[PDB]
Design an enzyme around this catalytic site. Sequence first.
Site, short mmCIF file in Angstrom:
data_model
loop_
_atom_site.label_atom_id
_atom_site.label_comp_id
_atom_site.label_asym_id
_atom_site.label_seq_id
_atom_site.Cartn_x
_atom_site.Cartn_y
_atom_site.Cartn_z
N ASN A 216 57.80 37.48 31.63
CA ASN A 216 56.47 37.13 32.11
C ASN A 216 56.49 36.03 33.17
OD1 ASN A 216 55.58 37.30 28.63
ND2 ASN A 216 55.65 38.97 30.12
N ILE B 11 53.69 32.03 36.03
CA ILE B 11 53.71 32.64 34.71
C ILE B 11 52.60 33.67 34.63
CG2 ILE B 11 53.49 32.22 32.23
CD1 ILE B 11 54.38 29.26 34.32
N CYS B 12 52.88 34.81 34.01
CA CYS B 12 51.87 35.85 33.82
C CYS B 12 51.43 35.81 32.36
CB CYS B 12 52.44 37.21 34.22
SG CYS B 12 51.24 38.55 34.43
N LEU B 13 50.62 34.79 32.07
CA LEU B 13 50.10 34.50 30.75
C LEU B 13 48.63 34.87 30.67
CD1 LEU B 13 50.40 33.06 27.92
CD2 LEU B 13 49.97 30.91 29.11
#
Lengths: 159, 157, 168
Positions: free
Chosen positions: A81, A88-90
């Site tokens: 992620n 960050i791909c949160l």
Amino acid sequence: HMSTPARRRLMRDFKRMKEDSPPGVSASPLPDNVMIWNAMIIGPADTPYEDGTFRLLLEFDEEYPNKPPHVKFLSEMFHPNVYANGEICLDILQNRWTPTYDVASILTSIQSLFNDPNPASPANVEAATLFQDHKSQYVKRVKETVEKSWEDDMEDMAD
Amino acid sequence: ELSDPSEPLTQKDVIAFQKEALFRCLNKWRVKANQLVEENEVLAAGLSKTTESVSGCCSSIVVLARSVVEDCSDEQDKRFLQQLINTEDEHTLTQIISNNSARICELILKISDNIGRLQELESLTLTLQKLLKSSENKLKKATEYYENIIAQYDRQD
Amino acid sequence: PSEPLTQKDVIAFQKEALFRCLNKWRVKANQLVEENEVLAAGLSKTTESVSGCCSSIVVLARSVVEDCSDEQDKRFLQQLINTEDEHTLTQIISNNSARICELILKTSGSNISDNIGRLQELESLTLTLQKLLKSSENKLKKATEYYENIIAQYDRQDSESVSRVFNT
């Protein structure tokens, strides 16, 4: 100065960090610019990121807490992620934000990505395909970034 | 040489966490490297001890081949038996015998499908028993290596 | 000292020295895994090719036992035919190598194998042994991780830094 509702809260978040800082979490707004934060997560135990010293950079906005901050890993990373530049791909940072989330809430939510990555968003296609099928080679590659993280002298954490 | 727990961390407290962590990683590599030299010598020893043992068969096969060339009929087989007899490099000879074992046993004796199946089964029966023994031995010797270090920790003072 | 020996001793060591030491062992471990993989490969490639020759002697032994007359030689061929330990088998062949060639040629003609049961007995055993080898190597593969885990967790349990950062 500290009269803006956003700036007012960011100092409120900071007080919490100064008194109840989550385990393996550091965070300090720049002494002059209270909108940019230096952060540092330590990979929890029983995770491939164990005992890593990963540095983060939190960039805020004038609308906070109504708007999420921009979050970038500064240490080199290998996570499904985490894009190649640190972003960050949160979920709570994208489409599931909430004003009840302070700095701690975001740094622990990123921390929890270490033990269980979100498989839905493969920012790192290699990390995602390693974590799903070839787990032994995954941990081998994650630990090489854990070693690199140690090089930094944590100058970002001084007073 | 650390600070208070219920406090945010320090530059000193993280440098001390990196050094203590650098040592643990150092130790994990040090133990992995030492276990491998023990296995690498036992492997390089057993690799030489296995090549030495073939000379009993190879010499016995060449003489048996030479005994039948005078009475051999097929010239592509007569040339093949000669090619077998005249190879000096033993590494070449062992494969020439291993790869063409079915051809060899027939040419010495002068059913054929049974030979191909018993040679395929005997070679594999022999190959696997030895490969299992060394694997069980690699497992036995490796457990001993790690438990040596474990015992030094379980009583260290 | 050049390299530290305890977790206590590292506080005095600077980071640049600890990194130099870690890499030397990490690089030594990578060369050793390559050496261990290529060596274990060449050991299997040789055992298949030694068994190639050994089996050809066993096959010739099985082919001539029926026409051998004096039983002290038949007992020798039987002892030879039914062993599966190559060290045992290779000694039997190296020590009695000329005798074997004598017994193979002394037999008048090529005689037919009489037992298909040994081929089924070997077929079942071939399958059972392949299963046992994979399970034995798996027992070793998981153990390398398992033992390296308990050894490392002993260093963690005694660490001051770990107990400060994470222990609540």
